């Protein structure tokens, strides 16, 4: 996160940290005690699936304070339309090996109904984006969870920044004046939108051109397109395999 501030401990309680072999990989969003949403591209280079771990209740990566809960990732599910190395359909659903315990520090973000998300949430100007990713483009990652409020654009208004590159499965948010953006390492983390006292998942940090680049916005996976997909998977009989492709739509 570029231009953000520390999310005080417990104020971003749906944030997930993904680790591989103990090293920081990506963010994620808790949506119930065994399910995390992240970005498909976080898994494009993995070979050590056995050592993928999700951490809930995390804040400061330098110390374990006791509110952290760590879980092996049992399964990563990605759309059948996702192609590694390409931006479209950048979403993954992760099944934890054992449920987390909900606490003051670990709480799921609401996965909204699609129509509510398109009719109502999409028109709340600012949403929060968070993560332990780079503090500047090509810079260092953060030790304490960072959070930033970014304003949303309809795609017509982002088109000029990324002509023909923003699909219906994406949206833009940020500032074209360059101050503030999500960044590398924040992928998979929530773009969370408040409405009338409750917070909902509206986007997943996905891609950009650099970070906080003038003229450009961050690009987020448009979660509204995936609500049914996610719901069906969470209801489904598990299939074997650590990496699963599931039909989309």
């Amino acid at each position: 996160i570029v231009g953000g501030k520390v999310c005080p401990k417990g104020e971003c309680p749906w944030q997930v940290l993904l680790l591989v072999n103990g090293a920081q990989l990506c963010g994620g969003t808790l949506i119930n005690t065994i399910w995390v949403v992240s970005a498909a591209h976080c898994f494009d280079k993995i070979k050590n699936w056995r050592n993928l771990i999700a951490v809930l209740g995390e804040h400061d990566l330098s110390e374990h304070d006791g509110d952290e809960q760590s879980r092996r990732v049992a399964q990563v599910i990605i759309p059948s339309t996702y192609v590694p190395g390409t931006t479209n359909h950048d979403i993954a659903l992760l099944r934890l090996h054992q449920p987390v315990v909900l606490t003051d520090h670990v709480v799921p973000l609401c996965l909204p109904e699609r129509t509510f998300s398109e009719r109502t949430l999409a028109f709340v100007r600012f949403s929060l984006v968070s993560g332990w990713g780079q503090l500047l483009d090509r810079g260092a990652t953060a030790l304490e969870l960072m959070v930033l409020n970014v304003p949303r654009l309809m795609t017509q208004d982002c088109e000029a920044s990324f002509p023909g590159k923003i699909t219906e499965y994406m949206f833009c948010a940020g500032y074209s004046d360059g101050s503030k953006d999500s960044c590398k390492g924040d992928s998979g983390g929530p773009h969370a939108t408040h409405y009338r006292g409750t917070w909902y998942l509206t986007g997943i940090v996905s891609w950009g051109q650099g970070c906080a680049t003038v003229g450009h916005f961050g690009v987020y996976t448009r979660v509204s397109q995936y609500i049914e997909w996610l719901q069906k998977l969470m209801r489904s009989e598990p299939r074997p395999g650590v990496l699963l492709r599931a039909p989309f739509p």
Binding site: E118, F123, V124, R125, F126, Q156
Partner: protein, 210 residues
């Protein structure tokens, strides 16, 4: 263009007098209807004028909530008789309005001379302190209530018996002028917000005469 489902609005225009503020646009509804959204530059978008055949939308009640803010509007088009068919991203075609800052941009309405009163070589001329669309609690604020010291009036007056016009200016709604006895004078006023760069003046009031 038989294959087109909607076309974007265009020529979005703010019509605003005494804070009564209506957005207008083109085209007339051709197999489509419109919805408007309005926001302050950093505020949430509120929808107005839902699925309408009008090519106008009254935004007064939104802009008067804070006349010093700058407002953005946009007009969405929807296919007629199929208004929820907005594409898979849920984003209808739209166009953005110019920015509008009511305090700076609303036109001053035509003023009215309320009264004049002469004693000898002196005359009072009073301008009506008329109402605007801005509410406070359960009441419409006057022009003076809204603008305070930013509002002045200018008087143009003349003796019927001579050429040449005279002028005076006031910080209030009242002028006290000197006149020659035995002459009938006539009067017109304009409202002015001297600090404005655009739309600084109203049109002239009706003319009133002794």
């Amino acid at each position: 263009s038989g294959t087109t489902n909607t076309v974007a609005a265009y020529n979005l225009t703010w019509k605003s007098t005494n804070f009564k503020t209506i957005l207008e646009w083109e085209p007339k509804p051709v197999n489509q209807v419109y919805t408007v959204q309005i926001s302050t530059k950093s505020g949430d978008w509120k929808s107005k004028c839902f699925y309408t055949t009008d090519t106008e939308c009254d935004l007064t009640d939104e802009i008067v909530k804070d006349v010093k803010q700058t407002y953005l509007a946009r007009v969405f088009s929807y296919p007629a008789g199929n208004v929820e068919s907005t594409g898979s991203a849920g984003e209808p075609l739209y166009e953005n309005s110019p920015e509008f800052t009511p305090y700076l941009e609303t036109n001053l309405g035509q003023p009215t001379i309320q009264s004049f009163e002469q004693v000898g070589t002196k005359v009072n001329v009073t301008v009506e302190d008329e109402r605007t669309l801005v509410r406070r609690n359960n009441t419409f604020l006057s022009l003076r209530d809204v603008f305070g010291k930013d509002l002045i009036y200018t008087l143009y007056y003349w003796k019927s018996s001579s050429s040449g016009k005279k002028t005076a200016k006031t910080n209030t709604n009242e002028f006290l002028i000197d006149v020659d006895k035995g002459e009938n004078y006539c009067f017109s006023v304009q409202a002015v917000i001297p600090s404005r760069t655009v739309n600084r003046k109203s049109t002239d009031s009706p003319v009133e005469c002794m």
